[PDB]
């Protein structure tokens, strides 16, 4: 090949060329994302319940769906909340890599034989079955800069003419409103319905009947008579589309002809299905739609998708509406990705300064660096052929990567030049030459280097996924830059190249070239009069090499290790949870404290925030809230204490102060679904029939037991809410039957007035919406309103509640938990500083061991990922060690010679730990890379250096020390060319500030330190290294000469 | 130990070992060799008949009685502001 | 798919205008049209004009007076004048539909109204002109949606020259002038158009790109591909 | 059977449409209401879209729907197909 292109320059052009094309197209092509998808499919069942409490919602609705979810493929396990709201949501989950679709048909299918067993409110509000994640994309929040429309206003807007197309898009797996579309509101007054002797029954029966669509036929209809010659619709009830035609809605005539209308009973108006969700926009009534990702969607086209359906709604909008968007979490990773792409760019810049000062000719410089923008961007190419995604992960691959690629085009270049210093040939045959000694090796290095970094393409679990992203990565262009080296270099070289005098080192040459091209010459001759040096005395630096192994054994012990770095996205969540009970009132009270507190001591750094009262990361309550906030740009908040971390800490402090609520603000983890980590996930089990009361009681005596291990465990604590006051009523079933009241209309009138009823659909502007039923709220706001109510009898006389029932105060649960078709209540907490996760759970293991009879556990979501285990580090790479050196062995047709080059591991690794513990960094995933990076290339160093001295020893007859000091001699300059190009190559990554800052900082560290200490120590010891081996494995004879 | 008859372990395996064992992995169908427990109500023609009484009286009875009610909410949304008190309004539960 | 020069409209219902205005639209947007024969031919509805029907009010009162159920005299109306399916029955071994229904000379002119009665409470019969009062009215026998809107498909092709992007780019043009409210989008033919007719200048430019790339490398030469690349317009003219 | 446009449309159509969500690779949809009592309602689908899943994905949407239509409709069923516009053949049987 090489010399195919030597004689063909335009050719090897055409090939790169074309590599490029590939790679550039695929850029244009590839999904964009910020990780690898390593979560498992969920999907969720969604049910409602209209004005049922907690209990009535799981014995009802929850227990029915969940006995009918069997034989679905990949279900790691299910969880329920049935709450007070009347609100049912079943989260099934499956195993990594299960189809969505598939996992969401069959879930469907179990669904619909529990269907009709439902109750008949329950379906009519529509079950839902989604695919999604459970986090929120973004918030899309809308409001009215005029004022023109209120908070209920905008919500009806945005949900009558917003919401569904949103809906509709692809990739959008879920769509919250921030407040409730308009229903036809019925307010019943009971006093004005005991005054004309009727009920809610009456007024469902009249509604049902007076806002009816009637199917009437047509005149001349088929089949017809014959002569026929009028056809046309008849039109008969049509739906009511106004207050106003409800309102005249004739409930009856009375004795002496009046009439009583459904408004002389009722307050009639538009007003929302429901109205428990309220959200403000720094402060003014808004609404808005909280969207999450479906399944495995890509996040960045998804996002494109709502905003260019969002622009063609815009135009048609209401005069002051205007669209806002307080929380995205998409802007991240366009801007990370591209501040990746800068240091890429930046990369290759270096790299042609450095080429500069060592060839010190234009043409001659370009020749390397043109090598690194055609494998990055066939990199892509191959990313596509294999179905990757462009991620930070596969990003950084391409940025550790530099090092390893610019190397093989360096070490071509540079031999040439070597070869027409020694011996003053030509460019043409100098290249040829050089191709000749050097084209074997390269081949034979990326060889023994897909061993370093294949291996771990096989870690198992959701965290392979990441370390197989750069393995791919990395292995894949570095094959691509010896195919690069060994096509475009050669003939590049061969016509590029500035022809070089024998004996000439441009010493001789003009201002600054001169003056560096002599420091370097007399530099190499003081390096090689060193060496010369230690290959006399060799004992003491065996003993050397020891200590830095041993400290390399030291720091790594002591480096702490985490998994990826939580980023600064510039948003962030603050959760607002008061105790069940509590007021929707005193809920705003805490979220405008909340508001507050970003608006005035954080004003500096929050741009915005969208608070919404109603909901919570448990879903719909009076008594929870969120608030979504935007930070200003990385840019303009500067300093760690301007970041989320400092923000949150800050924020939760003060927060803390907020009397009988739970307020914090927390920063999104990396992943999530991983684990923020030292965390556990437990879940306490009613094992026997043990019932709600004494699950409580298990729940709290292992709450108690686990607060005196505080050594142990710290922050153990219930997830869900904690029983309360509920109002019990009992029907007299005789006293009701002696009155002659039936138990339908009881039932009816007590549910409809105090928990509203969906009875039927209206059309609003064109658009078919709900009519409500439910007393006035005056008349259901206190325990002695209940006597207010009355119901008809049989011989038609009024009968108020209070003659046929009884009622108490009882305790009761707002939020009855099930696992996987059991009660269950959720237990969150960590592990206390200094000891292990796996620590903390084996001691709830033993606490949950003590537990009174019938009672279990169970681990779930990040608790269940890590127990399928991990620790497969010390295998994997055990058997990159032992590949590497068998690699080597059949390089060097050796069982002892690998060693000379194998022990040049540690001395990039003690770099890399020094620098990541003195900077405060982890022991992390781009730690880890970032040492096979740095250990590969060292590794290569080394290589090159035994290869060249055994050729010495082999090919001419060059003794030992001889072969080995012209070798190293030879190989000091390109060591240090791809060295130095590549440390300042990742200068920007170290200084990095701003977005995604802390992953490259993490990269940058780990490698500038594993790079300076490889480098100037592996220069003094593979020399030592390989002098050593060679005599401890010493056949008989050489040494002293060598025949010829 | 002869504390429990095959309808009650019938039962016992339907109520506390099936689902779960339908749910784990691999597992396609499970077939119940015997029947979960309900509540049985075994009429007698006779006292029906000396009562004026039929299964349809019987039937209306019991879904009357063995009921699980929506009731709503004191204190729900909308309230009237300055409402203290939130509360479930609990009716007829299931009989057990 | 298309009938070649041709597009695929559709005017949509954006705020709460309701049927007659988004016609009254349409009307617009069609009369504008035909004033540019010179690019725009055939503009026209897809789908069916509004048409008389009779509209038949029962009053509440008096039926409540008579003792007369809603639902009596809507099953008595929907039944007899529509048709309905009532339920299943066994025809030699196979399932089948039961649908009552009024006899064809019973159901042809507003006169027959009259002649059905309804059961009131205390048993008289009530014939449907004692609770009813009708008129004549227009409605559409036939309403369009398009992504969940209320919507009108318009039909028509370039004229006689002109392209169907021009043709297009007019009708874009014409509906910006419409009233407040009314938007529009492309659909099926046009849909694939706007979408996948940006796409052919760029794989014609791939293909040249990698010929020339090809030929470069054949030849080891940048320029002597040029004189195959001439070659093109030989045969084309020749086609043409 | 027996429906206007505007009923089939304001019972019917409307109430399908608002739950045709959470599908994927949908491009439009479009429908017509007709006052001999029929809507058709057609959603398209990318190029490239498996035809399967994108008709499983309609139909179990729907099925949640059916809840919300009115009575006479649930008894006729509310068919979920491919669409095609080319026969293979068409057979006429006659009687002379
Ligand atoms: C040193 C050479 C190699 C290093 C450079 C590699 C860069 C890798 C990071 C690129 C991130 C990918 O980002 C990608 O950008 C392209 C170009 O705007 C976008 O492409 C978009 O705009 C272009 C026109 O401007 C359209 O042709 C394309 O249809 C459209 O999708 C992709 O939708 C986006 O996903
Ligand atoms: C499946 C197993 C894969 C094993 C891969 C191991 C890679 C080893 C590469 O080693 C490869 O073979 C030999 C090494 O002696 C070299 O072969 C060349 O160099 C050496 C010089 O003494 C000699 O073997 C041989 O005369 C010459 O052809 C190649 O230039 C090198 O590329």
């Given at each position: 090949m090489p010399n195919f292109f030597i004689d063909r320059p335009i050719f090897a052009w055409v090939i790169a060329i074309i590599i490029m094309l590939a790679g550039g197209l695929a850029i244009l092509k590839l999904p964009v994302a910020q990780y690898p998808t390593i979560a498992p499919p969920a999907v969720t069942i969604s049910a409602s319940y209209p004005g049922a409490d907690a209990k009535t919602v799981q014995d009802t609705v929850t227990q029915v769906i969940e006995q009918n979810?069997?034989?679905?493929?990949?279900?790691?396990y299910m969880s329920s909340n049935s709450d007070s709201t009347g609100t049912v949501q079943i989260t099934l989950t499956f195993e990594s890599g299960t189809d969505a679709d598939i996992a969401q048909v069959q879930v469907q299918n179990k669904l619909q034989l529990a269907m009709p067993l439902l109750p008949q409110e329950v379906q009519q509000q529509g079950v839902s079955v989604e695919k999604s994640?459970?986090?929120?994309?973004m918030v899309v929040g809308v409001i009215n800069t005029d004022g023109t429309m209120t908070q209920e206003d905008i919500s009806d807007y945005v949900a009558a003419n917003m919401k569904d197309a949103i809906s509709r898009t692809?990739?959008?797996?879920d769509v919250q409103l921030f407040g409730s579309q308009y229903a036809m509101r019925i307010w019943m007054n009971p006093n004005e319905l005991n005054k004309f002797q009727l009920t809610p029954v009456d007024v469902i029966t009249a509604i049902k009947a007076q806002n009816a669509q009637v199917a009437a036929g047509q005149?001349?209809?088929?089949?017809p008579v014959k002569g026929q010659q009028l056809n046309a619709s008849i039109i008969a009830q049509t739906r009511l589309t106004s207050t106003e035609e409800f309102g005249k809605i004739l409930l009856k005539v009375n004795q002496d002809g009046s009439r009583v209308l459904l408004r002389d009973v009722a307050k009639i108006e538009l007003g929302?299905?429901?109205?428990?969700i309220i959200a403000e926009f720094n402060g003014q009534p808004a609404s808005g739609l909280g969207i999450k990702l479906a399944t495995g969607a890509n996040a960045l086209d998804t996002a494109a998708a709502i905003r260019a359906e969002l622009a063609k709604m815009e135009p048609f909008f209401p005069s002051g509406l205007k669209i806002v968007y307080?929380?995205?979490?998409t802007p991240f990773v366009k801007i990370s990705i591209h501040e990746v792409v800068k240091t890429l760019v930046e990369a290759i810049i270096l790299v042609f300064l450095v080429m500069y000062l060592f060839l010190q000719n234009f043409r001659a410089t370009l020749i390397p660096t043109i090598a690194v923008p055609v494998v990055l961007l066939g990199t892509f190419a191959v990313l596509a052929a294999f179905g990757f995604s462009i991620n930070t992960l596969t990003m950084f691959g391409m940025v550790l990567a530099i090092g390893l690629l610019v190397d093989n085009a360096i070490v071509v270049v540079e031999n040439v030049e070597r070869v027409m210093a020694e011996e003053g040939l030509p460019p043409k045959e100098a290249t040829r030459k050089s191709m000749g000694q050097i084209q074997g090796a390269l081949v034979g290095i990326a060889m023994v280097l897909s061993a370093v970094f294949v291996?771990?393409?096989?870690?198992?679990?959701?965290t392979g996924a990441i370390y197989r992203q750069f393995s791919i990565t990395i292995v894949s262009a570095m094959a691509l830059s010896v195919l690069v080296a060994l096509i475009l270099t050669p003939a590049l070289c061969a016509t590029m190249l500035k022809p070089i005098a024998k004996?000439?080192?441009?010493?001789?040459?003009?201002?600054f070239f001169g003056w560096f091209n002599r420091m370097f010459e007399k530099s190499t001759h003081h390096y090689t009069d060193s060496v010369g040096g230690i290959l006399r005395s060799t004992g003491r630096y065996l003993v050397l090499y020891l200590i830095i192994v041993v400290g390399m054994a030291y720091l790594f012990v002591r480096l702490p290790s985490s998994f990826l770095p939580d980023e600064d996205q510039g948003v962030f969540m603050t959760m607002v949870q008061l105790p069940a009970g509590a007021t929707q009132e005193r809920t705003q009270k805490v979220l405008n404290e909340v508001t507050h507190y970003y608006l005035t001591k954080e004003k500096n750094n929050v741009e915005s925030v969208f608070a919404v009262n109603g909901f919570g990361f448990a879903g719909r309550g009076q008594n929870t809230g969120i608030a979504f906030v935007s930070l200003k740009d990385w840019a303009d908040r500067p300093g760690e204490e301007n970041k989320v971390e400092a923000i949150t800490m800050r924020a939760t402090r003060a927060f803390?102060?907020?009397?009988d609520a739970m307020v914090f603000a927390f920063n999104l983890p990396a992943i999530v679904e991983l684990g923020t980590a030292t965390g556990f996930d437990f879940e306490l089990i009613?094992?026997?029939?043990?019932g709600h009361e004494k699950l409580t009681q298990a729940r709290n005596q292992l709450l108690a037991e686990a607060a005196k291990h505080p050594d142990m465990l710290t922050?153990?604590?219930?997830?869900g809410l904690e029983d309360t006051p509920q109002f019990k009523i009992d029907i007299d079933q005789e006293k009701a039957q002696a009155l002659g009241v039936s138990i339908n209309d009881i039932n009816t009138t007590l549910g409809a007035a105090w928990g509203g009823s969906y009875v039927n659909d209206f059309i609003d502007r064109g658009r078919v919406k709900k009519v409500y039923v439910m007393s006035e709220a005056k008349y259901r706001?206190?325990?002695?309103?209940?006597?207010?109510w009355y119901v008809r009898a049989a011989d038609g006389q009024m009968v108020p509640f209070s003659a046929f029932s009884s009622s108490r105060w009882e305790y009761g649960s707002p939020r009855l938990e099930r696992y996987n078709g059991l009660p269950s209540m959720e237990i969150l907490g960590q592990a206390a500083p200094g000891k292990s996760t796996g620590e903390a759970m084996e001691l709830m293991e033993q606490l949950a061991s003590?537990?009174?009879?019938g009672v279990g556990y169970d681990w779930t979501g990040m608790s269940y990922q890590e127990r399928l285990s991990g620790n497969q580090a010390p295998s994997l790479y055990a058997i990159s060690l032992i590949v590497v050196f068998l690699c080597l062995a059949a390089l060097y047709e050796?069982?002892?010679?690998?060693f000379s080059v194998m022990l040049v591991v540690p001395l990039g690794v003690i770099g890399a730990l020094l620098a990541a513990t003195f900077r405060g960094l982890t022991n992390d995933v781009y730690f880890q890379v970032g040492l096979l990076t740095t250990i590969g290339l060292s590794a290569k160093n080394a290589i090159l250096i035994v290869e060249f001295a055994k050729d010495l020893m082999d090919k001419e007859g060059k003794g030992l020390i001889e072969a080995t000091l012209d070798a190293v001699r030879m190989r000091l300059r390109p060591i240090l060319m791809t060295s130095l190009a590549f440390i300042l190559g990742v200068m920007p990554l170290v200084i990095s500030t701003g977005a995604g800052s802390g992953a490259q900082n993490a990269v940058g560290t780990g490698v500038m330190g594993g790079m300076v200490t490889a480098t100037v120590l592996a220069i003094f010891f593979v020399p030592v290294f390989f002098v050593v081996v060679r005599r401890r494995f010493?056949?008989?004879?050489?040494?002293?000469e060598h025949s010829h």
């Open positions: 979810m069997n034989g679905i493929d990949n279900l790691m994640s459970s986090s929120f994309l692809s990739g959008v797996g005149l001349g209809g088929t089949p929302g299905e429901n109205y428990d307080p929380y995205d979490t291996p771990m393409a096989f870690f198992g679990g959701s004996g000439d080192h441009g010493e001789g040459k003009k201002g803390s102060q907020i009397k009613d094992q026997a029939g043990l922050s153990v604590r219930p997830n706001m206190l325990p002695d309103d209940i006597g207010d003590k537990l009174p009879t050796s069982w002892s010679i690998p010493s056949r008989k004879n050489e040494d002293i």
